[PDB]
Amino acid sequence: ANVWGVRLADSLSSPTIETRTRHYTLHDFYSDLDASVGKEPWRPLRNQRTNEIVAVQLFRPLQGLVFDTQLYGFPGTFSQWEQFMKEKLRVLKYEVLRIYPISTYNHDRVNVFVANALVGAFLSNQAFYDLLPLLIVNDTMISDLLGTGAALSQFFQSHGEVLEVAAGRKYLQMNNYSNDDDDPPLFAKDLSDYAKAFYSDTYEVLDRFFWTHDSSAGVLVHYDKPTNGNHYILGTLTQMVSAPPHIINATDALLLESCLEQFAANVRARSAQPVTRLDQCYHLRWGAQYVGEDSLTYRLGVLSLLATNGYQLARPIPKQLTNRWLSSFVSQVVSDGINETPLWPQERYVQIAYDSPSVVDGATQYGYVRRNQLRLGMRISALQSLSDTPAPVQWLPQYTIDQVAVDEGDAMVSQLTQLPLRPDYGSIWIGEALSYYVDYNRSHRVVLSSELPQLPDTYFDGDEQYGRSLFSLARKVGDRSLVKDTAVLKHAYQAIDPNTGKEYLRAGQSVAYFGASAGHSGADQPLVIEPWMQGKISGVPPPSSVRQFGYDVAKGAIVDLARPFPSGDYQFVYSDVDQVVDGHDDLSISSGLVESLLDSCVHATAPGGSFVMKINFPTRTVWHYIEQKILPNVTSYMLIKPFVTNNVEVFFVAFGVHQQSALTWTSGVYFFLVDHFYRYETLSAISRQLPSFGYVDDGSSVTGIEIISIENPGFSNMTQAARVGISGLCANVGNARKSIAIYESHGARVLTITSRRSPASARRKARLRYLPLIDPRSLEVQARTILPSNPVLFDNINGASPHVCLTMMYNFEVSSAVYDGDVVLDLGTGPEAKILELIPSTSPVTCVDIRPTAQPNGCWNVRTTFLELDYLSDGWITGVRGDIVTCMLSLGAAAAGKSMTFDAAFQQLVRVLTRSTANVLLIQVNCPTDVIRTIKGYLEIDQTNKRYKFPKFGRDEPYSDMDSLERICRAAWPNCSITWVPLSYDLRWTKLALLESTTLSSASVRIAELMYKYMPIMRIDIHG
Amino acid sequence: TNEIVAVQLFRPLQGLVFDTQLYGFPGTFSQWEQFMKEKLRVLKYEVLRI
């Protein structure tokens, strides 16, 4: 590297091959004075925002615009200006072709000075005719200027073998230019006289002139291939204004333009395109004994020396320059940190590197000196830039072998903390409700009212209300009542009653509705009435007439539904009003409203029909009353619970009212209700731990996000402090997903490391003593601009895949089965073993896989072990011992790799586990439990050839069945006791998915259940 | 009419205590907001210089 602002050299390039240039012909003079469409002496420049022409660039046929544009009088639009220039060049064209014939002067030379001053005197109307016959040059180039035809000091004056000219107006400002930073810069090249040029023969005569001439403002040379012979540049005190912070004079403007041109040429050098000049920089000659150290001209002289040497910048320069980027470059160059290169500018001669790729010292002779004593440890090849993307991209770390303290990582992340900012929340739960249903069976069992579990007594807590409000606010739906009513009708029209052989209900039942909210932003009724009358549910029969009741209707009447108001009796009624709003926050008044509302609903049912109840708060009186009253007088019933909100409500459905029947509650209903209250308790304990909806994160909670911000100067090997910071965030994050972004933050290129913390990451971070450190190379290679995004709490939007769901299932049952202080063994650990995140922090591992992993070896509190030995073999468990075997997904993987069956793989594995010392074990087998279903797009079946063929993973393996597994297991161990685990229908596993901040998309978890019943596991003790 | 008749400003600016005749803002919201944009751009360049 960083000279004052950083540059990315790493090698250095230069244009090697060179175009030798042609010279003037008068045929070419007429050709480019005729402003053709293909070529013309001007070229427009435009804005980068509107693409409107705000400046023009002109060249060789005209340079003599040194007079004032008030004297010239050009218009303001580019089209009128260019046709004006066309017709004035046409008039002067006719004049000069009058005075010179093309036939005799077909191929004779000219003074370019006389040509430019001729077109300038014609545009300024300043009596060009004395200048006219000096057009065709004599034997030499400059003696016609020394022996003057007419002395014209308004254009050029002589000084005794030294010619002074006033080169002006390389560019020309159009009036729509308004010093916008997105507008292109001008470098003070549009003023009257930005500098003066001293054309003469030899540098010795020119320096003998400079003995007497002033050299206050510095003098600039070109030294490579001058425009019209060897000369100098004498800038004046006119300054550049178009950079808003910085005000630079003329000489700094010219040197900055030339050095940026050399920076452009150093990138485009591809060893095949010869350019028009070998180098570009100017090399200040006599001002070094005038101005001194730590001046802007001196610093740009240093940069021009490095540019002539052939260095390349850090930031990729634009093709079209802007005042914004130019002022940013000037702010970077006047910053700090004086030098790291061994190079310094000189006045005696110019210097190029000993290993420079430029050949300009051998190309032209005078002025260019090769140096031998100065050497560079850098490379030779070119450099390329990477293609920027507007989206944030993922990154994955790789661990080295060194380690520092986790307290050092804490100190560095406290230094680099950018925690207090509000993230975007998202949604924890998308999709639809879940079918949780049970029917009444007559010959099933019998239970009593007092046996039923209830709501927990810690229901009205502020923390419970906090969790349920967090869940109901995080969850994303359309209309919840729409979802609930569609679910309850699709479960209501399923089975048949024992009296009639046909079905439950038919088409045209003349139904009634209770408790209409009637506010749904349009269609002022519940949103199932019109699609259910049209039959859009496609699993129901359409009714005949619909009446909506309740004290919030729009079309019906408003009636207190608790007190019995008699109305017309209908074959089917549907209650939807709660007992909370009509209640006054008491379980007693809630139960009494259930009593009265159910009594009115029974007495208004048109007997032989059915009704549906919803119950928010069931109590002993509620269950005992409905068992003593309704269950005798009903034919059949139904109780279901679709689930979009964390609540204790269920949907009770009756069938065949007012017929007596010996009928009580059953143990299947009991298991359903036990599991319902249990999954309520588990999901409430999940929602109690999660932070709120609209909070700000500060790294205080165990779950949440974390970001830090560092800046990277060039491709420099960055410091150990930032390395400890990034590796400490890696140890904080625990091998989860992370995204980065690279963008110029407000004048400096910044780096962001965006990911999320978890309690499993916390136990991982507490597991290891020292944190390992990472490879900086994977971050230091990137040179593209990764545009950032807002911080979101949830990366995933569409929902977790069912394979992520089964991985979460498996991780949960392994973490539940493992205990604290235990040696384990993981068969098929995968790329990164999640068993490090599952087990407690004090229990060691003996884990091994065929896949070579990159886990941090060493610097642990309790020891780890990582190796590869082709685990389906013997001899090694006699070496290393364990207590409990965890073989997840490696059975089918090894069987598909070795093309062998599950029977042979399992008997070999149970043989080498008879070699083992473990008493308990649990492995991932692939056994069908239910009748196979050939799940669409995830799991199809195969009867004969006995395969599965996952199409999502593109994977395939056989399956073995539980009786053959029992045969092999009892042939190995005559003492073992096997327990097949049931499927996690109580949703205990859901905390490990929620605390990792990932939504679920409940169709995926339905497919996950239907899949987990096709590859379960078991628990086998060696005793029993 | 849903036409912008008032604006609400906050934390980066509160020092408008002087008279709007001394300030001189235009009457349309679009011209006013681009005027505020360019004046904040000029003061932005000044404070980033210093």
Binding site: - | F18, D19, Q21, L22
Partner: protein
């Protein structure tokens, strides 16, 4: 200890005063003059001059 006054009183920043127009009496005089400018500018009262 406190004294009541009809006009706002900002204290002197500097001890060498010099003229500026940033106060209430100049604003008052300017708005009165602005209304009389409107009063002579209206086409109903006098175009007659």
């Amino acid at each position: 200890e406190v004294l009541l006054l009809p006009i706002d009183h900002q204290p002197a920043n500097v001890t060498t005063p010099t003229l500026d127009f940033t106060n209430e009496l100049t604003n008052w005089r300017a708005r009165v003059c602005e209304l009389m400018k409107n009063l002579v500018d209206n086409q109903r009262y006098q175009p007659g001059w």
